[PDB]
Design a protein around this nucleic acid. Structure first.
Ligand SMILES: Nc1ncnc2c1ncn2[C@H]1C[C@H](O)[C@@H](COP(=O)(O)OP(=O)(O)OP(=O)(O)O)O1
Ligand code: SF4
Ligand SMILES: [Mg+2]
Lengths: 869, 187
DNA sequence: ATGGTCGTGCCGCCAATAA
C-alpha cells in the first residue's frame, strides 16, 4: 500500500471548537528535494473511554435496600444500555469487560476487580463526574482529555519518528505546512526507535518599541532576526550559530526619515528594507515568517511582553493573515502563557530568561546581566526616552539597527552556549510529555506525565483531573566557635531516592486510610515509584561517570554539571510532588514516612559515630561534621575511610562518601558557615579554595561595599597568620573604608541594593513602608519598560531632607544624577549596612566588638553600648 | 500637680525601697528592662502623672542615654501610650499589686525590679539600708522577718520606723497604696 | 503552580484590678 514516515514535534487540540481531533506537526523527508520540510497530519475519530465499577450488591436510591439477587455483569450492561444512554442521548457505543487495578486515595474500591469499559465518540455529550446508579458505585475517566488519551493509548514518549498507515488526502488545506496527511483512527499510528532525529530550523529575533508622546501607546519601529537552517539537536551548537539574517525599520508616524537615508542604505549594501508605515512592516514580517517557516523561535521576554505587544499591534493595525505567525489557519485569536500559547500554535517558543532562571542562579535576569555572566561581555543599554532624539540622524538610526542586531546575536549566542535545546529534548524524552511545554518551566507537569505513563504501562487506573503541613528535615545543634584542625564531612548520595528504593515506598505497598503508616512488608515486590526513580538515579550516575573522565574541555565540564544538576533536581522533585496539595498524585503520608525515615537514619548515624569517641558539630539531614582534632591528612583520611566502611556495612542501597575535607572552619549559626576546602593536585600536594555557605555576603539584598568588606574579613580570619596581626589588618581596612566612604571616592554603582518582587506592584497594601515596591511604582508610572511579578528592582537610599524614615527615601539609580537635591546617605550605609555584617561575622572571635568596630569606622559609639560611665 | 524637681525627694522619702532602687537605676544607667519600665510607668500613672509629663520625663531620660529621639519614638512611645490605655484596646491598667511584684515575674540578671526583701540578697541589703540611714535594730528585725518568710509585714515595719510612727494603720497590698499612706501622714 | 527548615529587617500590639 502507501506509508510515509513522520517526526512529530508538537500537538494541539480544541475540545470546544473541534471535539475528538488532534493536530500533529513535524518534519517529513523528501527524496527529490533531498531536504526536510514541515508537515502536519490530522487524526480523527478519537473516542472517550469509561470504566464502570459494578456493585457487589444493588441498593435502591431511597433506602439502599438489597433484595437478595447477586449482581451480574449483564445487569450493569443493561443498566447502562436502557437508563444512562436514553437520558443523556447516547446513540452508538461499544462495551466489553476488562481487568484493572486501583491503588489510590478513593476508598470503597477493591485493589483488583472487573470494570465495564464502554467507548463512544467525543461528539455525544459528557456524563457527570459523580454519577451513581443501581448496579454501579462509581465511574472513572469521564473528562479525560483527547490528547492525553491518544498519547497514553499509542505509548508515545516525547518527540520520535512515527509511521502513518493508509494516509488520506485533505479536501481543503488547514495549515500553512508544505505537506498534509489525514488518518481516520488513532489505531493506524505506530512508533519506531532506531532513527536519528533530523536537523531543525532555529529563528532568533528581537524588537525595539517606542512610546507615543501624544497618547499612552507603544509602537514597533525596528526589528531584526537571525536564521539557521541546519541546527542539530544531537550534537554541539554549530559554528557559526547563524547563516542568514534580515532587518526592517519604519518611522513611528510624525517624524520623517532623514534625507539621503536610502543612499546611505545603498552605500552600506546590507539586506535592510525600509517600511513606510507600521502595517507594511508587519506584513513584511508575516510574509518572511511564512517563507522561512521556522520551527523554534527563541527570544528574550517573549511570553511576558514581546508576544502580547506584537499581537496587540497586529490587532489594532488589522494586518492581513494574522495566523501566519502560528502554523494553523484561524480567524479570531484569544486573549488573556495561555493566550500566547494558543496564538503561537504549531511553532515552538523558547525564552532565554525562563531557561536561565531554571538552570543558572544569577543576581539578576536582565539581558545585560546575562551577557555579563554567561558570555563575560558588556552590553550598552540605550535609554528609552532618547529614541525620539536619535531619529533625525542617519548615523544614529544605523547605530540603533546595529544594536538591535547585536542584541539578537547575543540572545542566539546565549541560547547556544547554555545548550537549552538538547537538555529540554532529553528531559522530554525521559518524561514523555510535550516538549514545547517543557520550555515553559515547572516541575509538576513532568512528574505527573511520568507517573501517568508508569501507571498506564502497568495496567492501572489513574485519577481524574481536577477543576508547612508535616515534619520535615532535622538539623543538629551547632557548636559555634572557631576551629583550626582538620574537619571531615560525610554526605549521603541521593538520600530520599535511596530510602524509597530501600524501604519499597510506593502507592501499591503502603497501606493508608496525622499518623505515620507502618513500613511495608519486605516480602512484597518492588513498587512502581522505586523502579521509575532508579532510571533517573542511574542516568545521574552515568553523567557523573562521564564527569570523572580526565582531560575535558572547560565548557564541556560546565555543560555536564548543568545537565547533572538538572537531572538531580528532576529526581528530587518526585518526592516534593507527593506533598503538593494541587498535584494529581497528592499523598501526605508517604512524604511524612520518608521524612521520618530520614530523621531516624540521621539520628542512628550520629549516635553510632558518637560511639567511636569523635566530636560531631553539625549536620543538615544528611551530613555529619567530625572534628578529628588532627593535623596530618593521612590519619584523617584513614579515619574517614574507616567510618565510611562502618556506615556502609549496615545498609544495602544507601551509600556514604567523604564529600570534603576542611582545613579551617568558622561556624556562625545554622546553615551559615565558611571554610577552606582542601583539593589535592599532584605528588601528594594540596591546594586550598575558599567557599561560603549561607552567609549574608552571598545574598542579593546587601550593598556591594558591605559584601566586599565581609569577604575581606572572612579571608583574613581564615588565614594561617597570627591572631594578633589579623586584628590590626581588619582595623586598618575598616579605617580606610570609613575614610573612603566619607571622602566620596566610592563609585555610585557600589551602593545599589537588589530585591525581587513576588506580586504585582499594585497588590501591595504596605507601599508606604516597602522601598522596592515604591521604586517599582515610580518606574512603572513615570517610565517606559514595565516591571511585573518575578522581576528585580534596584534602589539606593539617598538623603532627601524631608525628615522621613530610611524606608521611605528610596530612589532609582538613574534618578540620582538626574536631580540635584539628592545625595548618597553615607550615615545609613556606614551604620546599617557595613557595621551589622562585620559585627555578626566577627562575633565568635575575640578582641573585636561592636564598640571597637564603631570607633574604627569613625561613627559615634554613644549609641551602641556606652551607658556605663 | 507633681513636677520634675521633687520626684527624687519623693522617691527618697515616700517610695518603697523597690521603686527607689528602680529610680536610682534609671537615673544612673539611663536605661531599664521591660519589667522595671512597666513597673515604674504603672506606678507613675498611679501616683497621678498624666501622659504629657510622663512622656517628657521618659524622653528626657532617654536623651541622657544618648539615643536619638526618633529611635525612642518608634520603639517605646507606642508602649508608653498603650500603658495608659490610649492605644489598641484603650483599656486602662492598674499598677501591679504588691503581691504580684513579690511573687509574679521574678527578676533575673540585669533586672532591678521586684521586692528587695525577697529578691535582693540580705548582705547587700545591709549596705542598702545603711545608705538609707536605717537603724541597726530595724535592720535586724527586717532580716529576721525575711528569714521567717515575712515580706508584707517586713515592709510594714520598714515604713513604720522610717516614718517615725509606731503603727502604720493599714494592710500592705499595693505600692501605690504605700505611697498614698505615706503622703497621708507626711502631708 | 515540588516539599520543609532556618535566619534578618520592617511594623503594630499587649500586661493591669486599690481606694
Ligand atoms: N530542591 C529540592 N527539592 C526537593 N527536595 C530537595 C531539594 N533539595 C534537596 N532536597 C531533599 C531531598 C534530598 O534527598 C535531600 C538532600 O539533598 P542534597 O544534600 O542536596 O543532595 P542528595 O542527598 O539528594 O545527593 P547529592 O549529594 O548526590 O546531590 O534533601
Ligand atoms: S513589700 Fe512590696 S512595697 Fe515593700 S519592698 Fe517589697 S515589693 Fe516593694
Ligand atoms: Mg527594645
Amino acid at each position: 500500500e502507501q506509508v510515509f514516515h513522520f517526526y512529530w514535534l508538537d500537538a494541539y487540540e480544541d475540545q470546544y471548537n473541534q471535539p475528538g481531533v488532534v493536530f500533529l506537526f513535524g518534519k517529513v523527508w523528501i527524496e527529490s528535494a533531498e531536504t526536510h520540510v514541515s508537515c502536519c497530519v490530522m487524526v480523527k475519530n478519537i473516542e472517550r473511554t469509561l470504566y464502570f465499577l459494578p456493585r457487589e450488591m444493588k441498593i435502591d436510591l431511597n433506602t439502599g435496600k438489597e433484595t437478595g439477587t447477586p449482581i451480574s455483569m449483564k445487569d450493569v450492561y443493561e443498566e447502562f444500555d436502557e437508563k444512562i444512554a436514553t437520558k443523556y442521548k447516547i446513540m452508538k457505543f461499544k462495551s466489553k469487560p476488562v481487568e484493572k487495578n486501583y491503588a489510590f486515595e478513593i476508598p470503597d474500591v477493591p485493589e483488583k476487580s472487573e470494570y465495564l469499559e464502554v467507548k463512544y465518540s467525543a461528539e455525544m455529550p459528557q456524563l457527570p463526574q459523580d454519577l451513581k446508579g443501581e448496579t454501579f458505585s462509581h465511574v472513572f475517566g469521564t473528562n479525560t482529555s483527547s490528547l492525553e488519551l491518544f498519547l497514553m493509548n499509542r505509548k508515545i514518549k516525547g518527540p520520535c519518528w512515527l509511521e502513518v498507515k493508509s494516509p488520506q488526502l485533505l479536501n481543503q488545506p488547514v495549515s500553512w505546512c508544505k505537506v498534509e496527511a489525514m488518518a481516520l483512527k488513532p489505531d493506524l499510528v505506530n512508533v519506531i526507535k532506531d532513527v536519528s532525529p533530523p536537523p531543525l530550523v532555529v529563528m532568533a529575533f528581537s524588537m525595539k518599541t517606542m512610546q507615543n508622546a501624544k497618547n499612552h501607546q507603544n509602537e514597533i519601529i525596528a526589528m531584526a532576526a537571525l536564521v539557521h537552517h541546519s541546527f542539530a539537536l544531537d550534537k554541539a551548537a554549530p559554528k557559526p550559530p547563524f547563516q542568514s539574517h534580515f532587518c526592517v525599520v519604519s518611522k513611528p508616524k510624525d517624524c520623517i526619515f532623514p534625507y539621503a537615508f536610502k543612499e546611505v542604505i545603498e552605500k552600506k549594501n546590507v539586506k535592510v528594507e525600509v517600511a513606510a508605515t507600521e502595517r507594511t512592516l508587519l506584513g513584511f514580517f508575516l510574509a518572511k515568517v511564512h517563507k522561512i517557516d521556522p520551527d523554534i523561535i527563541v527570544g528574550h521576554n517573549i511570553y511576558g511582553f514581546e508576544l502580547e505587544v506584537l499581537l496587540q499591534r497586529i490587532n489594532v493595525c488589522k494586518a492581513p493573515h494574522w495566523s501566519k505567525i502560528g502554523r494553523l489557519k484561524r480567524s479570531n485569536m484569544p486573549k488573556l502563557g495561555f493566550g500566547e500559547r494558543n496564538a503561537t500554535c504549531g511553532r515552538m517558543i523558547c525564552d532565554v530568561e525562563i531557561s536561565a532562571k531554571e538552570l543558572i542562579r544569577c543576581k539578576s535576569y536582565h539581558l545585560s546581566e546575562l551577557v555579563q555572566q554567561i558570555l563575560k561581555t558588556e552590553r550598552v543599554v540605550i535609554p528609552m526616552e532618547n529614541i525620539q532624539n536619535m531619529y533625525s540622524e542617519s548615523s544614529q538610526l544605523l547605530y540603533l539597527l546595529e544594536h538591535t542586531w547585536k542584541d539578537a546575536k547575543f540572545i542566539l549566542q546565549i541560547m547556544c552556549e547554555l545548550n537549552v535545546l538538547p537538555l529540554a529534548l532529553q528531559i522530554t524524552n525521559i518524561a514523555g510529555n510535550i516538549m514545547s511545554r517543557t520550555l515553559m518551566g515547572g516541575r509538576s507537569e513532568r512528574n505527573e506525565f511520568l507517573l501517568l505513563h508508569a501507571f498506564y504501562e502497568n495496567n492501572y487506573i489513574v485519577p481524574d483531573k481536577q477543576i508547612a503541613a508535616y515534619a520535615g528535615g532535622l538539623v543538629l545543634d551547632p557548636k559555634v566557635g572557631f576551629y583550626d584542625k582538620f574537619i571531615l564531612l560525610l554526605d549521603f548520595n541521593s538520600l530520599y531516592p535511596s530510602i524509597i528504593q530501600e524501604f519499597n515506598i510506593c502507592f501499591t505497598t503502603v497501606q493508608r486510610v496525622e499518623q505515620i503508616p507502618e513500613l511495608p512488608d519486605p516480602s512484597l515486590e518492588m513498587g512502581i515509584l522505586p523502579r521509575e526513580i532508579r532510571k533517573l538515579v542511574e542516568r545521574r550516575k552515568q553523567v557523573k561517570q562521564l564527569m570523572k573522565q580526565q582531560d575535558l574541555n572547560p565548557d564541556l565540564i560546565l555543560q555536564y554539571d548543568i545537565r547533572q544538576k538538572a537531572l538531580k533536581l528532576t529526581a528530587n522533585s518526585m518526592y516534593g510532588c507527593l506533598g503538593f496539595s494541587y498535584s494529581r498524585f497528592y499523598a501526605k503520608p508517604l512524604a511524612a514516612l520518608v521524612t521520618y525515615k530520614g530523621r531516624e537514619i540521621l539520628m542512628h548515624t550520629k549516635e553510632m559515630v558518637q560511639k567511636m569517641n569523635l566530636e560531631v558539630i553539625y549536620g543538615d539531614t544528611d551530613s555529619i561534621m567530625i572534628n578529628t582534632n588532627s593535623t596530618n591528612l593521612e590519619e584523617v583520611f584513614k579515619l574517614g575511610n574507616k567510618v565510611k566502611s562502618e556506615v556502609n556495612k549496615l545498609y544495602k542501597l544507601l551509600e556514604i562518601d567523604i564529600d570534603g575535607v576542611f582545613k579551617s572552619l568558622l561556624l556562625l549559626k545554622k546553615k551559615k558557615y565558611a571554610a577552606l576546602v582542601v583539593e589535592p593536585t599532584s605528588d601528594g600536594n594540596y591546594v586550598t579554595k575558599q567557599e561560603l555557605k549561607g552567609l549574608d555576603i552571598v545574598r542579593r539584598d546587601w550593598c556591594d561595599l558591605a559584601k566586599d568588606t565581609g569577604n575581606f574579613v572572612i579571608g583574613q580570619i581564615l588565614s594561617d597568620q597570627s591572631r594578633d596581626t589579623i586584628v590590626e589588618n581588619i582595623q586598618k581596612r575598616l579605617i580606610e573604608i570609613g575614610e573612603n566612604v566619607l571622602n566620596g571616592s566610592v563609585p555610585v554603582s557600589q551602593f545599589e541594593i537588589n530585591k525581587a518582587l513576588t506580586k504585582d506592584p499594585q497588590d501591595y497594601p504596605d507601599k508606604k513602608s516597602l522601598p522596592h515596591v515604591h521604586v517599582a511604582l515610580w518606574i512603572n508610572s513615570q517610565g517606559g519598560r514595565k516591571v511585573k511579578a518575578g522581576d528585580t528592582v534596584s534602589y539606593v537610599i539617598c538623603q532627601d531632607g524631608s525628615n522621613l524614615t530610611a524606608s521611605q527615601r528610596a530612589y532609582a539609580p538613574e534618578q540620582l544624577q538626574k536631580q540635584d537635591n539628592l545625595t548618597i546617605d553615607t550615615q545609613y550605609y556606614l551604620a546599617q549596612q557595613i557595621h551589622p555584617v562585620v559585627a555578626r561575622i566577627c562575633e565568635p572571635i575575640d578582641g573585636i566588638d561592636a564598640v571597637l568596630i564603631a570607633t574604627w569606622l569613625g561613627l559615634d559609639p554613644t549609641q551602641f553600648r556606652v551607658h556605663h560611665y | 500637680k507633681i513636677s520634675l524637681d521633687q520626684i527624687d525627694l519623693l522617691s527618697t522619702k515616700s517610695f518603697p525601697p523597690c521603686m527607689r532602687q528602680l529610680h536610682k537605676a534609671l537615673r544612673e544607667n539611663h536605661h531599664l528592662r521591660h519589667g522595671g519600665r512597666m513597673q515604674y510607668g504603672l506606678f507613675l500613672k498611679g501616683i497621678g502623672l498624666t501622659l504629657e509629663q510622663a512622656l517628657q520625663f521618659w524622653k528626657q531620660e532617654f536623651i541622657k542615654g544618648k539615643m536619638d529621639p526618633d529611635k525612642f519614638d518608634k520603639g517605646y512611645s507606642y508602649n508608653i501610650r498603650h500603658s495608659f490605655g490610649k492605644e489598641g484596646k484603650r483599656t486602662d491598667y492598674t499598677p501591679f499589686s504588691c503581691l504580684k511584684i513579690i511573687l509574679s515575674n521574678p527578676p533575673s540578671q540585669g533586672d532591678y525590679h521586684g521586692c528587695p526583701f525577697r529578691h535582693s540578697d540580705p548582705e547587700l541589703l545591709k549596705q542598702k539600708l545603711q545608705s538609707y540611714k536605717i537603724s541597726p535594730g530595724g535592720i535586724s528585725q527586717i532580716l529576721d522577718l525575711v528569714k521567717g518568710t515575712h515580706y508584707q509585714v517586713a515592709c510594714q515595719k520598714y515604713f513604720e520606723m522610717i516614718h517615725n510612727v509606731d503603727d502604720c494603720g493599714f494592710s500592705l497590698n499595693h505600692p501605690n497604696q504605700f505611697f498614698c499612706e505615706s503622703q497621708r501622714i507626711l502631708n
